[PDB]
């Protein structure tokens, strides 16, 4: 909302004004990664014991 | 599939209310409540100095 | 009525306070319709545009521009004037001040230029703040359109001299138009602006078609219908002007546009559109000169 | 503010609003004491400029300035005045029977001689007798007529049309089947404009007059397209025939009628719902 | 003959003889020559059983 | 106002409802005076006569016998309009939206012109019901009369194409600077001929028996442009009058007939009001309460009645 100021002359009257704006989210999806070696799974499943 | 939109914030501002006394230039004025001044048009302000 | 308040400037002389009282009912042309208006904006010095005080041409441009206003009540430090052109049709009855013709029960008055009569008549000049109010003359439309063509005719006889045009008898009025002693030297020099338009746009109007019709009808339905109406009426003066005077498409077509806008402006400058109407009630309906008349908004 | 009133004290030599109805298109009589002077000008000198001085001088003889300037020609008074002029018989003799019984027909014969003479010396009956209103009341004495006959546009027939249905209110009779030339034969539903049209023709039927009304949903600036059509009287050869002033708006297209009730059987039209937007005359060619 | 959108006869004598005899007394016979755009304006009889 | 409702017929596309949301303050040409109307009688398909759509002269000919109205409120099913030619009887002062490259003034008379500039297309599209709505261009009356005189003489160039093929433009308008480009595409014969006839007709009635007395003063003007500054700007450089000098003939019928006074009024009545017969009549006058002296291109202007 904006305040206004009275004057006296040919400069006009001042209506009270407003803005009422809206913004929009923009989204990024950011990535990490890691792998496991092939003979490292068979330790975890219990196949290689 | 679940899809939706949402609103996230309604931020408003407070109107900054000031009275005229709070400024520093309240010294230089002598503000008197003097009604019906425009109903006379005769310019006569006199005081003894 | 949305009566816009014209502000008197700061203190004036006592004869200047009484002079603006007798203007109660004159016509005032306000440029904008702010509810607060100064009086210098109203005055004739605010009509100065080209660095000169205007003639009746420059007044009729300005009078066809800004908005009319009748002074309702004259107040201390304020003038309360309701404008004409705001409001719906036929609302807000108010009083005009009559000037010498009759202004009958109807007749649709026109707020037309002050120098159509004696030069410094009605020029209310405040000596204190040193400004000038030239109030215009409220005349009805057939009496408006007659006289504004009557004075521009007179300047032609003065523009190159050798019946007195200025009789114009009305229903009860023997209208003395001639102020011979000092005004006809000053009224003729003010239509110097308006005459030279009126001469040109005729001579640019006639001489264009005098070289159009020989260059047209020679390359359909234009030839059939136009000559069907001008059978020995304009063709009689076609042989008359081409013989008793002198005789290029591209200068002509570039002059076709230039005349038509200039001839179009004189339709708005002259011809004096009815601003307001008189329509009386409980009244004698035949208004004396200097008498108040009930006057309502739209034609 | 959708309400206005007029009031004018005139004489009963013309319209005589007693024998007239509550609905009457009162035209004026603008400037009777004029036209020895402008009848002289606005015409070639081969037009016998003393004619409006004499024929209206006979008309004032048919009955000094008086305490009431001569006004209020009715719309009734004009129908008989051009009854021999427009090409319509046995529908024009009825309105003349309404006048010579209820209004003296010597005031008609002196007036129709003026109607030929006005167009003779080129000073037309338009730019004369501007529209005046709708005749609310007639408080008329023996010699006077102080008629409240409201001008000022739309409300003048609605203020005499809202309370109209009970008893007999205005109804605004067109007063002739030959008059009220109801246009838009090629027409559909819409709010129409009323006009007041005077047609002319120089030396064909010797400066002829025709006084009637047209009704159209056509603009006054597009009416000249239709007024140049629909006539055979385009053969003057000077000019300025077919004048018209806007009577205003009829915003009820179904409400036009055909009846024969007055006073003498006078064929008539009920016109229910009128805007009296007063307008101005428009005559160039 | 209420609505013609077909070309007429060449012979104007045949063009009126085959009309004035046809539109002589049909109550679907228009009581004027036709306008260019619009209906034919069929007459109304005084009453109908 | 006599508020005229324009029914929005069928479905509506979600941008097509927003198409009407930005038109509050434009001008509807409606060919009647209705209290109820459907939208297709307004649209540019209804401008289309038998077989062809009108050209930029015939659009004015369509606009002449079609009544202007201004959108006052916007609803999804109705567009409440106010017919300027009738319903301008307002203490409400119906607003107008400037749709032009032009700042008008405060107080100038405003008339309507079809879209005739290169970038001011303004033809909206409705995908639900296929209608085009060429909105007219509200312009000041000195500007509009300076437009219409260009198209007429260009249409007369379309009559007879003598000189070789290097003609001057009549495609260039100046208004406070601002070299404006018109759209010069096609010139329909009847739209020329109906506009050509009235101009030739009106100028013949502007010459009366006392007109040739004014033709005597042609060397009187050329002496004045040699010694006055107002006359020199009045007789312009590309004037036929300056080429014309490259005649009283008393003949007086009655010798008192006021020979000038009839030649002025008849010229004023016939060739003076050429702006009413070529273009539409002015009815729109800019009336700004708050003290705005100008109305910007794209802004709103409160409007009162006839000039």
């Amino acid at each position: 909302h904006q305040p206004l100021i009275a004057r006296d002359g040919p400069h006009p009257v001042e209506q009270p004004v407003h803005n009422y704006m809206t913004k929009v989210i923009d989204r990024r999806a950011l990535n990490a990664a890691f792998s496991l070696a092939t003979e490292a799974i068979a330790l975890l499943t219990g196949e290689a014991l | 599939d679940v899809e939706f939109d949402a609103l996230l914030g309604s931020y408003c501002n407070t109107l900054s209310l000031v009275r005229f006394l709070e400024l520093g230039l309240s010294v230089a004025c002598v503000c008197t409540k003097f009604p019906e001044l425009a109903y006379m048009n005769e310019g006569r302000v006199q005081f003894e100095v | 009525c949305f009566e816009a308040d014209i502000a008197i400037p700061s203190g004036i002389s006592r004869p200047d306070a009484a002079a603006l009282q007798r203007c109660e009912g004159r016509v005032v042309f306000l440029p904008t319709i702010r509810r607060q208006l100064a009086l210098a904006d109203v005055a004739h010095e605010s009509f100065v545009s080209g660095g000169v005080s205007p003639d009746t041409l420059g007044l009729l441009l300005a009078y066809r521009r800004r908005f009319p206003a009748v002074i309702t009540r004259v107040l201390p430090t304020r003038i309360v004037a309701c404008p004409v052109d705001l409001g719906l049709t036929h609302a807000g009855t108010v009083n005009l001040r009559n000037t010498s013709p009759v202004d009958l029960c109807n007749g649709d008055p026109v707020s037309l230029v002050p120098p159509v009569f004696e030069g410094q008549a009605t020029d209310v000049r405040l000596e204190s703040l040193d400004l000038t109010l030239r109030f215009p003359v409220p005349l009805p439309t057939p009496l408006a359109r007659e006289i504004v063509a009557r004075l521009v005719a007179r300047g032609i006889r003065d523009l190159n001299p050798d019946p007195d045009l200025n009789v114009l008898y009305y229903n009860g009025a023997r209208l003395s138009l001639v102020a011979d002693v000092q005004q006809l030297a000053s009224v003729n020099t003010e239509l110097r602006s308006l005459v030279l338009n009126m001469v040109y746009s005729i001579t640019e109007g006639t001489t264009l078609i005098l070289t159009l019709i020989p260059r047209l009808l020679a390359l359909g339905y234009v030839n059939a219908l136009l000559q069907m109406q001008s059978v020995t009426r304009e063709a009689a003066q076609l042989i008359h002007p081409e013989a008793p005077m002198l005789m290029r498409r591209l200068p002509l077509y570039e002059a076709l546009v230039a005349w038509l806008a200039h001839a179009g402006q004189l339709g708005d400058i002259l011809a004096l559109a009815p601003a307001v109407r008189v329509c009386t009630f409980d009244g004698a309906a035949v208004v004396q000169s200097g008498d108040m008349a009930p006057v309502i908004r739209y034609p | 503010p959708r309400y206005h009133l007029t009031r004018q004290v005139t004489l009963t030599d013309l319209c005589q609003p007693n024998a007239e109805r509550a609905g009457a298109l009162l035209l004026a009589l603008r400037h009777p004491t004029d036209l020895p002077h402008l009848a002289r000008h606005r015409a070639p000198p081969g037009r016998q400029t003393e004619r409006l001085a004499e024929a209206w001088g006979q008309l004032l003889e048919a009955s000094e300035s008086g305490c009431a300037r001569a006004g209020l020609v009715s719309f009734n008074f004009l129908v008989a005045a051009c009854a021999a002029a427009y090409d319509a018989r046995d529908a024009a003799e009825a309105v003349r029977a309404h006048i010579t019984t209820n209004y003296a027909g010597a005031r008609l014969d002196r007036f129709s001689e003026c109607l030929r003479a006005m167009v003779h010396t080129h000073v037309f009956p338009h730019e004369v007798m501007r529209f005046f209103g709708g005749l609310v009341s007639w408080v008329t004495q023996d010699e006077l007529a102080s008629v409240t006959a409201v001008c000022s546009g739309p409300q003048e027939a609605t203020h005499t049309g809202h309370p109209g249905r009970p008893r007999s209110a205005v109804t605004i009779p067109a007063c002739a089947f030959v008059d009220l030339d109801a246009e838009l034969c090629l027409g559909g539903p819409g709010a129409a404009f009323l006009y007041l049209v005077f047609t002319y023709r120089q030396c064909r039927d010797q400066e002829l007059c025709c006084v009637y009304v047209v009704k159209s949903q056509l603009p006054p600036r597009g009416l000249e397209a239709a007024l140049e059509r629909l006539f055979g009287r385009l053969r003057i050869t000077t000019c300025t025939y077919a004048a018209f002033a806007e009577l205003g708006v009829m915003p009820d297209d179904s409400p036009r009628c055909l009846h024969r009730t007055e006073r003498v059987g006078v064929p008539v039209v009920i016109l229910e719902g009128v805007v009296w937007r007063p307008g101005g005359w428009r005559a160039c060619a | 003959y209420l609505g013609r959108g077909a070309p007429p006869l060449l012979d104007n004598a045949a063009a009126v003889y085959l009309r004035n005899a046809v539109v002589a007394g049909n109550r679907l016979g228009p009581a004027q020559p036709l306008p260019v755009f619009g209906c034919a304006q069929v007459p109304r009889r005084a009453g109908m059983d």
Side-chain angles (χ1 to χ4, degrees), chain B residues 6-21 23-24:
Chain B
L7 191 144
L8 283 78
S10 297
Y11 297 110
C12 180
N13 57 352
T14 64
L15 179 61
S16 67
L17 267 299
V18 68
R19 68 185 70 191
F20 176 70
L21 291 177
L23 294 175

Side-chain angles (χ1 to χ4, degrees), chain A residues 1-7 9-13 15-38 40-49:
Chain A
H1 315 281
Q2 294 183 358
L4 69 108
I5 292 164
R7 293 189 302 276
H11 301 94
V13 80
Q15 63 165 352
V17 304
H18 304 290
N19 292 122
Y20 297 157
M21 66 182 74
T22 58
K23 295 187 180 182
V24 170
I25 295 283
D26 50 346
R27 289 196 304 276
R28 283 80 174 270
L30 52 90
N31 302 319
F34 70 100
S35 65
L36 282 81
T38 300
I41 296 102
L43 271 302
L44 266 300
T45 303
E47 181 70 23
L49 290 177

Side-chain angles (χ1 to χ4, degrees), chain C residues 4 6-10 36-40 42 77-80:
Chain C
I6 298 168
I8 305 295
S10 66
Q36 182 182 4
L37 291 175
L39 188 141
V42 165
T77 67
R78 291 178 68 193
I79 293 171
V80 176

Side-chain angles (χ1 to χ4, degrees), chain D residues 185-187, chain E residues 32 34-41:
Chain D
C185 295
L186 283 70
Chain E
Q32 72 172 1
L34 297 180
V36 184
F37 292 99
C39 70
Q41 295 184 358

Side-chain angles (χ1 to χ4, degrees), chain D residues 96-108:
Chain D
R96 187 173 173 87
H98 192 194
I99 296 173
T100 59
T101 58
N102 297 319
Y103 287 172
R107 292 173 290 176
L108 291 169

Side-chain angles (χ1 to χ4, degrees), chain C residues 88-93 104-107 141 167-172 277 279-281 283 285 296 299, chain D residues 1-8 31-34 37-38 130-132 148 151-154 237 278-279 281:
Chain C
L88 58 97
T89 67
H90 301 277
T93 306
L104 287 78
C105 186
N106 292 309
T141 48
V167 177
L168 209 151
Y169 279 169
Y170 196 64
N171 65 358
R277 285 182 69 91
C279 206
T280 64
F281 181 70
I296 59 176
Chain D
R2 64 184 293 168
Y3 187 73
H4 192 263
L5 292 172
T6 74
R7 189 173 185 272
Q8 190 176 7
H31 303 285
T33 66
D34 202 0
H37 178 75
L38 194 273
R130 191 185 284 267
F131 181 77
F132 189 71
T148 62
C151 69
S152 300
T237 65
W281 294 97

